[PDB]
Amino acid sequence: DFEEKMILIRRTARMQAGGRRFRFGALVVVGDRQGRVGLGFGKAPEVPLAVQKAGYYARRNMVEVPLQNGTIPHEIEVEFGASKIVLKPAAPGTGVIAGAVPRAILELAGVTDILTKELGSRNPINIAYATMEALRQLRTKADVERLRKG
């Protein structure tokens, strides 16, 4: 039903009594190319377990993206921690112009035409969180007019 994309896996280490113990963290995006995306971060002693956990969390944590003509209603700037994301709607025939992480997130939501830019820190985790936040902060004409008018 859903597609998975694996943004990254990283091997982290903690120091025991004179030794290194390892753990693995996976960042997985889940989507249906129809305006529903989830993002998960999973830590486990082994890579497959990490990927499974990330997939689970991603399926548990979903957001709806209000698409039309396969683009965004309006431009948005979102800062998460020290990282900043800029998204802008593009006319059909542009394609997805983004870094690896925003591209992977936005494709699985069904966005086909968008202009993006990353500013400040470019940690993939923070960028991914910022992207999801921006997607969560999108309003349409109908929503805005419903709020303002009633």
Partner: peptide, 9 residues
């Protein structure tokens, strides 16, 4: 061709 556009951008 979306991939081609993305490539050339």
């Amino acid at each position: 061709e979306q991939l081609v556009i993305e490539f050339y951008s």
